[PDB]
Amino acid sequence: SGFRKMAFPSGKVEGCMVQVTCGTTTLNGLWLDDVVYCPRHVICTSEDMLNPNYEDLLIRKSNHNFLVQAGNVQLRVIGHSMQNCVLKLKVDTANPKTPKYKFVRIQPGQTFSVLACYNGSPSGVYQCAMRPNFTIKGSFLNGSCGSVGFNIDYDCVSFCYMHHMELPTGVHAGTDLEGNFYGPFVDRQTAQAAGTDTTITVNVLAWLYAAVINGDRWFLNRFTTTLNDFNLVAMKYNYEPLTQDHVDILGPLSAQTGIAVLDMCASLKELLQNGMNGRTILGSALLEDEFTPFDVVRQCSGVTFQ
Amino acid sequence: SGFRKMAFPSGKVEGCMVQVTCGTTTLNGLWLDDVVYCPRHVICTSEDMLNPNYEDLLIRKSNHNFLVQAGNVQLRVIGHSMQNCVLKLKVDTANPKTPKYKFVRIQPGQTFSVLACYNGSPSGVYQCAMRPNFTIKGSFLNGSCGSVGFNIDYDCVSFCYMHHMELPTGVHAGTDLEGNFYGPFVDRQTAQAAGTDTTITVNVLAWLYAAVINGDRWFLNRFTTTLNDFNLVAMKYNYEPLTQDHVDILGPLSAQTGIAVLDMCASLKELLQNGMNGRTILGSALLEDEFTPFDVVRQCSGVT
Numbered sequence: 001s002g003f004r005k006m007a008f009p010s011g012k013v014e015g016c017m018v019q020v021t022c023g024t025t026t027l028n029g030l031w032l033d034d035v036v037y038c039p040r041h042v043i044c045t046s047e048d049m050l051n052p053n054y055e056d057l058l059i060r061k062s063n064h065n066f067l068v069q070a071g072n073v074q075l076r077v078i079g080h081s082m083q084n085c086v087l088k089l090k091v092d093t094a095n096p097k098t099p100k101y102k103f104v105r106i107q108p109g110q111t112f113s114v115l116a117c118y119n120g121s122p123s124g125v126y127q128c129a130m131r132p133n134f135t136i137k138g139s140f141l142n143g144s145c146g147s148v149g150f151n152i153d154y155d156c157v158s159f160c161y162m163h164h165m166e167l168p169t170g171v172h173a174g175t176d177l178e179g180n181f182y183g184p185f186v187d188r189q190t191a192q193a194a195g196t197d198t199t200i201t202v203n204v205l206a207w208l209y210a211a212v213i214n215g216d217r218w219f220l221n222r223f224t225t226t227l228n229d230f231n232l233v234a235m236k237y238n239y240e241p242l243t244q245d246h247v248d249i250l251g252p253l254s255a256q257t258g259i260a261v262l263d264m265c266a267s268l269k270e271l272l273q274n275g276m277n278g279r280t281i282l283g284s285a286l287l288e289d290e291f292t293p294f295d296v297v298r299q300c301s302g303v304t305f306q
Numbered sequence: 307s308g309f310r311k312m313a314f315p316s317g318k319v320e321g322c323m324v325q326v327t328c329g330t331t332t333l334n335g336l337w338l339d340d341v342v343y344c345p346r347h348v349i350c351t352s353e354d355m356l357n358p359n360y361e362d363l364l365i366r367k368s369n370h371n372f373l374v375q376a377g378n379v380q381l382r383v384i385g386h387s388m389q390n391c392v393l394k395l396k397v398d399t400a401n402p403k404t405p406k407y408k409f410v411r412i413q414p415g416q417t418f419s420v421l422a423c424y425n426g427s428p429s430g431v432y433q434c435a436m437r438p439n440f441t442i443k444g445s446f447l448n449g450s451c452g453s454v455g456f457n458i459d460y461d462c463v464s465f466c467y468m469h470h471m472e473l474p475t476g477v478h479a480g481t482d483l484e485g486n487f488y489g490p491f492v493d494r495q496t497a498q499a500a501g502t503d504t505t506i507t508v509n510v511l512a513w514l515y516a517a518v519i520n521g522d523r524w525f526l527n528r529f530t531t532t533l534n535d536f537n538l539v540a541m542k543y544n545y546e547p548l549t550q551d552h553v554d555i556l557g558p559l560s561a562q563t564g565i566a567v568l569d570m571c572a573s574l575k576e577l578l579q580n581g582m583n584g585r586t587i588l589g590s591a592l593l594e595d596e597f598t599p600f601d602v603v604r605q606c607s608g609v610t
């Protein structure tokens with residue numbers, strides 16, 4: 001029993017984190033095979049960041065301008081190149097701790113673990129969802145750039161996120177490992193803002209199933225609804241539309257608990273319309289939307305990663 | 307910016323997790339140097355759950371009754387002894403991944419990370435606090451016994467918890483790494499119930515200071531309180547008493563934000579009286595109590 005916001009074990013990623021220094025800027029890099037990945041804004045001074053020409057700034061740098069420390073061991077940079085908003089530093093040594101890995105781009109609503117790091121040294125791990133507005137509600141201080149997000153599927157690490165910047169509301173923006181931003185953001189010091197966010201409906205439903213599995217049942221009722229009917233309520237309360245594919249994905253949890261998705265949707269409609277009436281669900285007074293269906297199944301079934 | 311329930315990176319502990327089998331029972335062990343630590347109830351059979359005599363059960367075992375598997379490798383057990391409620395298995399290989407470590411017994415209100423494991427392989431990492439009733443609110447399935455809790459301040463792993471059992475309310479009980487249970491619990495299946503739990507007041511105050519540091523002041527008020535009047539109110543809401551030690555411990559956060567500790571207590575008193583009126587604090591609609599003063603300073607900026 002119990003249900004906690006849970007990260008993947010971070011050991012496989014910890015062995016890939018290095019410190020990257022260019023001039024006065026130190027941040028984190030990801031060392032995999034013989035390449036170190038980090039944000040291309042590592043090469044900018046503060047005035048550069050106002051309106052950077054990245055190809056032009058890069059041309060002045062020699063390999064020896066990139067100091068890379070893995071632990072207390074210097075790495076030798078033998079090449080450099082840019083892919084979208086990430087810098088790739090070719091180094092003379094393959095990382096002997098490189099895990100089995102892939103670069104994947106995730107979809108809004110999907111979750112991943114963040115290994116927050118400073119000076120190439122991991123300092124904390126936590127679980128994030130990619131919001132519908134393509135931000136993440138992370139916890140990052142100065143020096144965290146280049147920290148990464150990831151999932152583990154069997155023995156393979158799927159890297160999905162690299163941290164680049166904080167937005168004025170305190171939420172965070174970054175890229176996939178091929179340098180493509182999540183969301184309508186740019187790596188430049190300019191006026192940028194998170195769009196209005198919404199709630200991830202399929203995730204809230206997953207978490208209600210987690211609650212039932214853990215004995216929290218007071219919100220269940222006799223009613224059911226239709227997709228069309230529910231999605232009208234969803235739109236009214238700033239919830240993402242629920243699709244038929246969402247219902248299919250929740251199939252397992254519906255069969256395990258005996259509560260059909262639209263049965264549970266009727267529960268959620270009543271909570272949105274009437275609130276929680278001073279009660280809580282899995283210790284929360286808010287409807288939690290950063291557990292996917294897969295997250296709930298895996299935590300309520302004990303899948304392991306060694 | 308931002309504030310998250312943040313665990314320590316688990317890699318240093320992952321490298322120590324092994325599987326221990328005795329008879330038909332498999333659970334997790336912690337392999338440090340040449341010793342594997344695990345819950346002594348691995349030697350119980352279904353016959354033994356209510357009143358096991360661990361000394362009598364242990365004297366009947368030889369080294370080779372214990373199977374220890376580190377990854378795909380069998381370690382050879384060359385000695386065994388029992389210390390309180392943990393079993394210590396001497397093995398013929400020191401763990402090459404042993405970090406700098408120590409064993410620490412923690413006090414209620416302290417937080418730590420849990421590396422949930424099954425069959426010697428890590429499943430997930432999350433953050434916990436030791437409740438005032440000496441339980442923890444974990445996420446543990448059958449087979450998770452021997453999973454450990456830890457902090458890593460300054461590259462040394464302080465092991466503070468080993469998971470032993472689940473109580474009927476769904477909360478969890480365990481030992482320090484010297485095998486002494488937290489609280490009054492015992493490794494028997496005789497009926498045991500956690501005491502009434504209470505909110506960790508000093509942690510709530512810390513988290514309110516975290517909210518101010520991150521730029522939120524909506525819950526403050528113009529009042530102050532004496533420490534005794536604060537306690538007289540807060541215990542009516544099942545809050546732990548706040549001691550002068552706690553007041554002293556909050557000094558640094560008070561200095562950073564410019565809000566006196568007893569002024570923050572007055573803000574908490576009013577929050578308990580009013581609720582949040584639809585608002586949130588650091589993204590929560592409840593007052594959060596599993597962040598310590600030390601956690602807040604470690605996660606937050608120092609600038610506010």
Ligand SMILES: O=C(O)c1cccc(-c2cccnc2)c1
Pocket residue numbers: 490491492496497498499500
């Ligand atoms: O101290 C003991 O030996 C003991 C024996 C039986 C039961 C309990 C116990 C422990 C915790 C809660 N309720 C009961 C302790």
Ligand code: NA
Pocket residue numbers: 220221222223224262263264266267
């Ligand atoms: Na229903």
